[PDB]
């Protein structure tokens, strides 16, 4: 009974979904399937294609009759076709599938454009598993897609598209008639669809893509959901259509992106900024026109957003924004962080703590930014360059706090070529290095900052009266440091007497001295360090220490000479 | 892929589902009743606002935000006049192609229904299902024109009909 | 940083377990409410109180948890009075009254000077009845209290409590005379020793574990006391408990020092007599110097103790013993014997690291301060498997130390068999380098089979960057020994360099220090080498080039000396020679020009400075 | 002050963490990847959360928990060790090792906070591990080294607090180290050399671990050890491809006095190391035994003979057989380079040393036989590391 062959159906289909009997639901499905009623048919189909799996008079009954279905026109013919062909499609035997090309065929001569229509989708699903059916079929599609209505347009125009993906020789050869098609379209949707398959279609075959293109923008300039806003972005984006030609195109879609963009909703922006970056890194143009959308991005709290924003303001700059910037970031990274780093508040107005946000690794890009923006060109105009010095050992700080080392490298390095350059603020600098060394929390991570610090102290320490007390730091903090900076501390301090011994004139004053004498008695520490390269390398310096007191005592101005008269010697005596 | 389509009325009543892929079988019906209930706290602008949900959101308050994402599962949802419309798509077919195949399908909906009811989509659970599948097809969403899809749903009806005890 | 440690932890420290202490009210056990009185007040009441009642047994309960505010650091608390109450308590002739009351004590102490001084007075007047038991235990906080007014005090007591025959007191009243000794020492040194002494003579580990953390202390100020009392601690470890044993140590290591028989008349006399051993002078007899903690049964039963602790199987009093093993000795107390067969014994059965090291190390400093005993061990030492990097590395030191020169060839053939063939890590490779660097500073004769190897090693291995920075610094020391087979070990690695323009940033400096360094010896020779790195300098790296600065210096150096007047040059009254007119600056010269010109190429300024210097010493004369 | 003691094991894994209220979160650290260095650490930050690691774990553990201020680092290895007595006996002292830690990680830290307070029959069950060194060379097996580890412990059944007296013997290897638990006491005088003195805990009490290097003892006492100490394994090569033939005999011959190995566990590593363990397949054939057991791990290219406490006195469970090196694949070569067999052998009421206990009794101006008895079934026991035989 045609009643009891639907009814069936729904029921048998959820048995067949079980991995059951399917002999008992078969025979039902099949002479279901054979029943002209179309919509047993259409059912039947979706049954089968679940079940036919393994019994043969099963599958075998189910094409045999799905053609004599297909086979006469049909007329209502539409759903018979149109769902006899998605159902086909489920199944997959070679001897059906054989048939049901042959089918799909002729359902493409109805007319009716929603036989037109299924016939072209299942065209797809059957293509997908075997090609000889495709090869009979072809031509017929061709012949459809000259239809005139819009929605069959669509169709042969999606299913092309897969069977590009698996086929696309043969789609080639149709593409031209997609796009006649695509040109008759006044519906939003079909101009979206029409546009993906073209962009996969392009990756196969720019000659299509250029046809095509012009004809998405005209629709998209026809639409308004905004959906195509997005859609065709992400095609021109993709099929990397874009390549210029299609900038026309891509405006269209970025202008679209950019009034979406200007919503505070991570759901729009996000893709928005994504395809922003993208196109940009594709079209400056459209960048100069993002950089307002940019700068908002800035204080945007998703984390795709940030981090794709920080990498467009890195391209993008003003000083005077530059050094705005830079405060600004300091404070939002101590507020900004947190949130999905672990919990999870609910995001309203009403937290009014509120949820709070970045992940876990933007803390370091957020300094080694800040070193950026000092030295990109020459913030020759942090025009203070105080400030600069300050955040610097700001940011130093609160790195302690995650270390990454590398945050605590690179902002040392540049503390150097800002002290070097900038007389004025040394003593800043100085006085804070000497506290920061002396404070502990430099020494924690940070054997870099100390590196750096003590080659700048031992350029200025001319600026320090007690050029003494501050030997005397760096003599007492060598014997807490790591390797590396043991090396250094050992390097620069030598580096440094050389300078004072070049200004000591206030009298050489006999002071200086001593203080040879005291970083003698320290290298002498390090020449305790367990490798052997290190040790050696230590203890070459101090010795050439204990020369320089020689030599301030036979003069003032003749000292730097001098030193490297001994400091030689000793450093061969060792080595040799 | 779009492993599931989800149905339901502007009252939270489910009604038809498509799982293109292996997923709970029994569970997805009772799955499908609890991201009814989040479709009802959100707004009617925020219409559907797709869900998505760790999973242990399903009733779930340890997030505050609560939502369903029916584990890892997308659900994208969307308002149409009266009817609501849930896609669990996976997470590697494209959003875009899933909101469009979603917004379009309720477009034909309507059109494919003049007066839909709860109850007209229930029965034609098969029909509402080929439209879904059609606009799919080869990746294919191949009419996407609302005016067709119209016709196309009204084919399937045909054709359903002329085959009915295996369908109805 | 910090974060992500914590949290580890805090995240399971939260419901770690069942909320703590509200689910330890809610669910205690029997007992399982006291959790929230006492911990939501036992009070002071519930001391005070039972402190005021002139009953020892009362005071004992409220002793007891008078303990715990005191410790609260509830400083609103007169912890004057518990204190004094538990002063005057201590009095009382019951043994756990005055057990808990010595709890409080060093509580406030730790604390608060004052009253650290009222709580010595108590322990003053008990301390002078005549009950052992209690004489002790109060002799006992009197110690546990840091501080120096407590001298005056603590003494007239340890006085009477060492006049006492029993073990218990014996053992406290060490506790005191010390933590109290530290600060008093013009009213009280008469008698803190006539006591201290009698006393040691006990037991009881609670009562030497006592009088150690003590005689650690009095001492440090009037140690001849401390020694005749020193002695038994030593010989009480080897009887006790491994706690009793590690406090031995930190003492051992304190005490003799701050004696040192600080040289008054120091009797020389005493045993085979290097410092002089006291024996106290008011104790009897044959004086017994000061110098006696070098001197004197006490500072080296020190060393015995230590070894039985090794012994004993806990390690971390293997450790602290190694570690004051080495740390006093006069070597002489390193030729036990004893520290090698147990060390090497204990070495493969710790499994605990602190050990390993100190017992591989032992194996060395051993050897070296005493080869003879580990001839046994040799092919004992042939590495373990399980052992770690410095392991292994403490294995060539070994090997190093055997060695005879008869015996040496036995021996080579082990080394470069390891490294070659072990499977040696890196590190070990790098010590294997500081070790034959000593080996052959032995031997003549074998020497080049030594450095040889080393080079071997290096010439050819591009080897890693730690590594060659080790070779190198070790090179330079063998170099300093050999100089015959020296020159080779130059010429050789100036070859290496010449070669590779692209070598290592870190290898070039070794290798161009060592040349700096062997110049002394022949310096008439480096000259090629600088040669050669100058033509290629100026393609390498910065520290590179400032070791390479330095390094052309001091070759020139040593020589200036002897080239300048040498250099006061191609004046050619140098090529004319004394000694070391080492054809001299034009060879030199011709070299350090190169250098410093390249040097000047790199980025660091002391490379840079030194390299500028160099020449224009170099240069003047 | 906030004070925290986190057990950490061998490679630095923290296991317990325990914290004291209110609201809490490199030399020798680089090497702990190594058993037992951790002590002094600084974690260091500017707050005065100074923690000294002063670094023991004893029993697989690592105990290093840092204090919230002053201290001072020795001063807190000592409270560091005492918190780890007291969790093995609150477990019941038998094991804390990591996996016992992390269930009892609650009473661990519950103790710390009760310790940082803290202000009739007997036997004397000897248990000893022993761990010998052994070297093949020239047919027999020569004891290169080893270490026998003796804990005796006792286990009573009193009712008050009565003293024991422990005779032990030399079985003439100069015994020479005994050492003694702390609820034992070994006066030099009164309890002569080869006697101490037990003084009752309830708790079960190891009540002198010894320690006793066989080579020298071994030599000393001339003694190949035929009874034990020496298992003499003969593995002949004249092999072929798959087999060979080894004979390893266990007499009780000098074990007869013993009682039995409360489970000798035999480990034979056949170096699967180097050869991967498909070529080793090897098989053990012949494994001659009266009252254990002999399975073999040999996918995992392991020897475990497992013999049961049951063999009583004398009698030899005869320990030899064949192992036969079957190949899965061709790809053996017919090499195994053959490693390092360690015996750990447990002997239950033997002395590690030879502190053999002839009888043990109470002790108090008593008499034998004034009222008390002797009990069976102390039981102590014995670890070290453990021997090895080298061929």
């Known amino acids: 009974d045609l009643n009891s062959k639907t009814?069936?159906?729904?029921?048998?289909?959820?048995?067949?979904?079980?991995?059951?009997?399917?002999?008992?639901?078969?025979?039902?499905?099949?002479?279901?399937?054979?029943?002209?009623?179309?919509?047993?048919?259409?059912?039947?189909?979706?049954?089968?294609?679940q079940s036919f799996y393994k019994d043969s008079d099963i599958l075998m009954l189910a094409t045999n009759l799905l053609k004599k279905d297909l086979k006469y026109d049909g007329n209502n013919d539409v759903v018979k076709v149109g769902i006899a062909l998605s159902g086909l499609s489920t199944i997959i035997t070679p001897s059906l599938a054989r048939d049901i090309a042959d089918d799909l065929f002729t359902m493409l001569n109805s007319t009716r454009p929603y036989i037109r229509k299924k016939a072209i989708t299942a065209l797809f699903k059957v293509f997908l598993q075997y090609p000889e059916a495709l090869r009979d079929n072809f031509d017929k599609f061709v012949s459809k897609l000259d239809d005139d209505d819009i929605s069959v347009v669509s169709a042969a125009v999606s299913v092309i598209c897969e069977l590009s993906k698996k086929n696309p020789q043969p789609f080639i050869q149709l593409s031209p008639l997609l796009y006649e098609i695509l040109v008759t379209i006044d519906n939003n949707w079909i101009i979206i669809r029409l546009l993906k398959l073209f962009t996969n279609l392009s990756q196969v075959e720019p000659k299509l893509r250029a046809k095509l293109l012009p004809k998405i923008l005209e629709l998209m300039e026809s639409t308004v959901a905004t959906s195509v806003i997005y859609e065709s972005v992400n095609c021109i984006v993709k099929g990397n259509m874009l390549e210029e030609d299609d900038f026309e195109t891509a405006m269209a879609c970025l202008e679209r992106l950019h009034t979406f963009c200007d919503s505070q909703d991570p759901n729009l922006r996000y893709i928005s900024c994504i395809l922003f970056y993208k196109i940009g890194k594709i079209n400056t143009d459209f960048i100069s026109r993002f950089d307002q959308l940019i700068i908002r991005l800035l204080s945007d709290v998703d984390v795709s957003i940030r981090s794709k924003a920080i990498e467009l303001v890195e391209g993008i700059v003003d000083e005077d924004n530059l050094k705005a910037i830079v405060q600004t970031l300091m404070k939002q990274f101590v507020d900004e962080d947190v949130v999905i780093l672990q919990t999870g508040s609910i995001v309203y107005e009403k937290s009014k703590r509120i949820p709070i946000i970045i992940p876990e690794n933007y803390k370091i890009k957020m300094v080694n930014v800040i070193i950026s923006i000092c030295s990109a060109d020459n913030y020759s105009s942090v025009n203070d360059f105080e400030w600069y010095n300050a955040v610097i050992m700001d940011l130093a700080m609160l790195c302690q706090d995650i270390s990454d080392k590398s945050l605590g490298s690179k902002i040392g390095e540049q503390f150097r070529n800002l002290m070097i350059k900038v007389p004025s603020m040394r003593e800043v600098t100085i006085a804070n290095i000497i506290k920061l060394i002396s404070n502990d929390n430099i020494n924690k991570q940070l054997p870099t900052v100390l590196r750096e610090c003590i080659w700048c102290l031992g350029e200025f320490s001319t600026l320090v009266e007690n050029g003494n007390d501050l030997i005397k730091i760096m003599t007492e903090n060598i014997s807490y440091y790591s390797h590396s900076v043991q090396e250094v501390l050992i390097l620069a301090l030598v580096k440094v007497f050389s300078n004072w011994c070049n200004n000591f004139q206030e009298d050489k004053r006999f002071e200086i001295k001593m203080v040879l004498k005291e970083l003698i008695e320290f290298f002498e520490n390090l020449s305790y360090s367990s490798t052997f390269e290190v040790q050696e390398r230590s203890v070459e310096v101090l010795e050439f220490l204990r020369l320089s007191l020689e030599a301030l005592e036979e003069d003032t101005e003749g000292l730097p000479m001098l030193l490297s008269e001994v400091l030689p010697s000793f450093f061969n005596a060792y080595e040799l | 892929?779009?492993?599931?389509?989800?149905?339901?009325?502007?009252?939270?009543?489910?009604?038809?589902?498509?799982?293109?892929?292996?997923?709970?079988?029994?569970?997805?019906?009772?799955?499908?009743?609890?991201?009814?209930?989040?479709?009802?706290?959100?707004?009617?602008?925020?219409?559907?606002?797709?869900?998505?949900?760790?999973?242990?959101?399903?009733?779930?308050?340890?997030?505050?935000?609560?939502?369903?994402?029916?584990?890892?599962?997308?659900?994208?949802?969307?308002?149409?006049?009266?009817?609501?419309?849930?896609?669990?798509?996976?997470?590697?077919?494209?959003?875009?192609?899933?909101?469009?195949?979603?917004?379009?399908?309720?477009?034909?909906?309507?059109?494919?229904?003049?007066?839909?009811?709860?109850?007209?989509?229930?029965?034609?659970?098969q029909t509402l299902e080929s439209v879904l599948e059609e606009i799919v097809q080869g990746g294919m969403v191949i009419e996407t024109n609302v005016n067709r899809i119209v016709a196309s749903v009204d084919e399937l009806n045909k054709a359903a009909e002329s085959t009915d005890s295996k369908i109805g | 940083m910090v974060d992500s440690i914590h949290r580890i932890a805090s995240a399971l420290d939260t419901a770690k377990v069942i909320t703590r202490e509200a689910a330890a009210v809610a669910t205690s056990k029997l007992g399982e409410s006291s959790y929230t009185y006492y911990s939501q007040n036992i009070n002071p009441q519930q001391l005070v109180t039972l402190l005021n009642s002139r009953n020892s047994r009362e005071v004992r309960d409220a002793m007891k948890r008078i303990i715990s505010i005191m410790a609260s650091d509830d400083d609103s608390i007169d912890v004057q009075l518990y204190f004094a109450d538990v002063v005057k308590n201590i009095t009382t002739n019951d043994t756990k009254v005055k057990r808990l009351i010595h709890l409080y004590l060093l509580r406030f102490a730790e604390n608060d000077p004052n009253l650290t001084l009222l709580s010595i007075n108590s322990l003053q007047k008990s301390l002078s009845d005549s009950n052992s038991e209690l004489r002790c235990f109060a002799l006992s906080a009197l110690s546990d209290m840091k501080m120096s007014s407590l001298a005056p005090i603590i003494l007239h007591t340890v006085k009477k409590l060492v006049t006492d025959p029993s073990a218990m007191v014996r053992g406290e009243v060490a506790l005191a005379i010390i933590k109290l000794y530290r600060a008093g020492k013009n009213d009280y040194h008469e008698e803190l020793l006539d006591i201290l002494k009698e006393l040691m003579a006990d037991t009881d580990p609670k009562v030497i574990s006592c009088a150690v953390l003590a005689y650690k202390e009095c001492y440090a100020d009037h140690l001849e006391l401390l020694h005749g009392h020193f002695r038994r601690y030593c010989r009480i470890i080897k009887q006790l408990d491994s706690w009793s044993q590690s406090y031995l140590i930190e003492l051992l290591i304190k005490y003799c020092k701050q004696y040192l028989p600080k040289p008054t008349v120091v009797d020389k006399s005493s045993e085979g007599?290097?410092?002089?051993?006291?024996?106290?002078?008011?104790?009897?007899?044959?004086?017994?110097?000061?110098?006696?903690?070098?001197?004197?049964?006490?500072?080296?039963?020190?060393?015995?103790?230590?070894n039985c602790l090794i012994y004993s199987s806990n390690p971390t009093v293997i450790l602290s013993c190694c570690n004051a093993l080495y740390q006093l000795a006069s070597p002489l107390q390193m030729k036990n014997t004893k520290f090698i067969e147990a060390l090497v014994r204990t070495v493969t059965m710790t499994e605990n690291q602190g050990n390993k090291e100190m017992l591989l190390q032992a194996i060395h400093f051993l050897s070296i301060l005493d080869q003879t005993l580990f001839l046994p061990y040799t092919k004992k030492f042939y590495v373990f498997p399980k052992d770690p990097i410095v392991a292994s590395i403490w294995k060539i030191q070994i090997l190093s130390t055997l060695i005879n020169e008869s015996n040496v060839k036995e021996i080579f053939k082990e080394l470069?068999?390891?490294?070659?063939?072990?499977?040696?890590?890196?590190?070990?490779?790098?010590?294997?380098?500081?070790?034959?660097?000593?080996?052959?500073?032995?031997?003549?004769?074998?020497?080049?089979?030594?450095?040889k190897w080393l080079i071997d090693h290096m010439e050819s291995h591009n080897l890693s960057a730690s590594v060659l920075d080790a070779y190198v610094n070790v090179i330079r020391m063998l170099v300093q020994k050999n100089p015959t087979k020296h020159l080779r070990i130059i010429f050789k690695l100036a070859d290496l360099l010449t070669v590779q323009t692209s070598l290592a940033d870190n290898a070039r400096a070794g290798i161009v220090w060592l040349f700096g360094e062997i110049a002394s010896i022949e310096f008439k020779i480096c000259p090629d080498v600088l040669r050669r790195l100058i033509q290629n300098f100026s393609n390498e790296g910065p520290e590179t080039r400032c070791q390479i600065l330095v390094l052309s210096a001091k070759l020139l150096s040593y020589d200036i000396d002897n080239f300048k007047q040498a250099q006061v040059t191609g004046s050619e009254?140098?090529?004319?020679?004394?000694?070391?007119?080492?054809?001299?600056?034009?060879?030199?010269?011709?070299?350090?020009?190169?250098?410093?010109?390249?040097?000047?190429?790199?980025?660091?300024?002391?490379?840079?400075?030194?390299?500028?210097?160099?020449?224009?010493?170099?240069?003047?004369g | 002050m906030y004070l925290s003691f986190y057990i950490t094991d061998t490679k630095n894994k923290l296991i317990f963490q325990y914290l004291?209220?209110?609201?809490?979160?490199?030399?020798?650290?680089?090497?702990?990847?190594?058993?037992?260095?951790?002590?002094?650490?600084?974690?260091?930050?500017?707050?005065?959360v100074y923690k000294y690691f002063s670094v023991i774990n004893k029993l697989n553990y690592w105990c290093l928990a840092s204090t919230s201020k002053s201290k001072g680092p020795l001063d807190c290895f000592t409270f560091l060790e005492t918190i780890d007595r007291i969790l093995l006996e609150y477990f019941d002292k038998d094991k804390l090792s990591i996996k016992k830690i992390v269930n009892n990680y609650d009473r661990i830290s519950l103790i710390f906070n009760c310790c940082v307070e803290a202000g009739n029959e007997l036997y004397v069950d000897l248990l000893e591990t022993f761990h010998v060194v052994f070297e093949k060379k020239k047919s027999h097996l020569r004891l290169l080294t080893g270490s026998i580890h003796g804990i005796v412990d006792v286990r009573s059944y009193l009712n008050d607090n009565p003293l024991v007296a422990v005779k032990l013997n030399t079985m003439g290897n100069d015994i020479g180290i005994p050492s003694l638990h702390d609820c034992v006491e070994i006066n030099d005088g009164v309890f002569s050399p080869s006697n101490i003195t037990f003084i009752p805990p309830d708790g079960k009490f190891r009540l002198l671990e010894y320690s006793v290097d066989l080579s020298s003892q071994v030599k000393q006492s001339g003694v190949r050890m035929n009874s034990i100490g020496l298992m003499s394994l003969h593995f002949q090569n004249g092999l072929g491809k798959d087999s060979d033939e080894f004979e390893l005999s266990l007499n009780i011959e000098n074990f007869k006095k013993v009682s039995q190995v409360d489970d000798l566990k035999i480990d034979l590593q056949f170096n699967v190391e180097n050869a991967d363990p498909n070529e080793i397949a090897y098989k053990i054939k012949i494994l001659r035994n009266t009252h254990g057991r002999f399975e073999n791990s040999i996918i995992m290219g392991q020897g475990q003979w497992i013999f049961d406490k049951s063999t009583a006195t004398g009698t030899v469970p005869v320990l030899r057989g064949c192992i036969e090196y079957e190949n899965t694949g061709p790809n053996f070569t017919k090499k195994v380079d053959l490693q390092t067999v360690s015996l750990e052998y447990s002997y239950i009421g033997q002395s590690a040393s030879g502190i053999y206990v002839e009888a043990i009794d109470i002790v108090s101006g008593l008499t034998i036989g004034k009222n008390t008895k002797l009990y069976k079934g102390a039981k102590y026991k014995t670890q070290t590391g453990n021997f090895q035989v080298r061929l």
């Open chain 1, 7 to 49: 009814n069936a159906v729904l029921k048998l289909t959820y048995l067949e979904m079980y991995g059951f009997d399917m002999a008992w639901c078969n025979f039902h499905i099949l002479e279901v399937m054979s029943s002209n009623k179309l919509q047993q048919k259409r059912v039947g189909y979706l049954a089968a294609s």
């Open chain 2, 1 to 125: 892929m779009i492993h599931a389509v989800l149905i339901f009325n502007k009252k939270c009543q489910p009604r038809l589902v498509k799982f293109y892929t292996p997923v709970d079988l029994p569970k997805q019906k009772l799955l499908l009743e609890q991201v009814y209930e989040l479709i009802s706290q959100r707004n009617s602008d925020f219409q559907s606002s797709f869900l998505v949900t760790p999973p242990s959101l399903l009733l779930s308050n340890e997030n505050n935000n609560d939502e369903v994402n029916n584990e890892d599962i997308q659900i994208i949802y969307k308002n149409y006049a009266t009817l609501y419309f849930t896609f669990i798509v996976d997470d590697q077919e494209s959003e875009l192609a899933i909101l469009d195949l979603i917004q379009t399908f309720v477009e034909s909906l309507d059109r494919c229904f003049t007066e839909v009811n709860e109850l007209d989509l229930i029965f034609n659970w």
């Open chain 3, 273 to 306: 007599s290097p410092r002089s051993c006291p024996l106290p002078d008011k104790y009897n007899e044959i004086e017994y110097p000061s110098y006696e903690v070098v001197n004197d049964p006490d500072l080296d039963l020190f060393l015995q103790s230590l």
């Open chain 3, 416 to 451: 470069k068999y390891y490294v070659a063939s072990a499977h040696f890590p890196e590190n070990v490779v790098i010590m294997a380098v500081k070790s034959l660097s000593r080996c052959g500073q032995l031997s003549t004769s074998w020497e080049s089979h030594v450095m």
């Open chain 3, 573 to 620: 009254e140098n090529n004319q020679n004394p000694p070391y007119y080492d054809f001299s600056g034009s060879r030199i010269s011709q070299m350090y020009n190169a250098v410093l010109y390249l040097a000047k190429y790199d980025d660091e300024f002391d490379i840079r400075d030194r390299a500028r210097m160099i020449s224009s010493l170099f240069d003047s």
């Open chain 4, 20 to 48: 004291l209220g209110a609201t809490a979160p490199p030399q020798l650290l680089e090497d702990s990847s190594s058993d037992d260095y951790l002590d002094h650490s600084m974690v260091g930050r500017d707050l005065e």
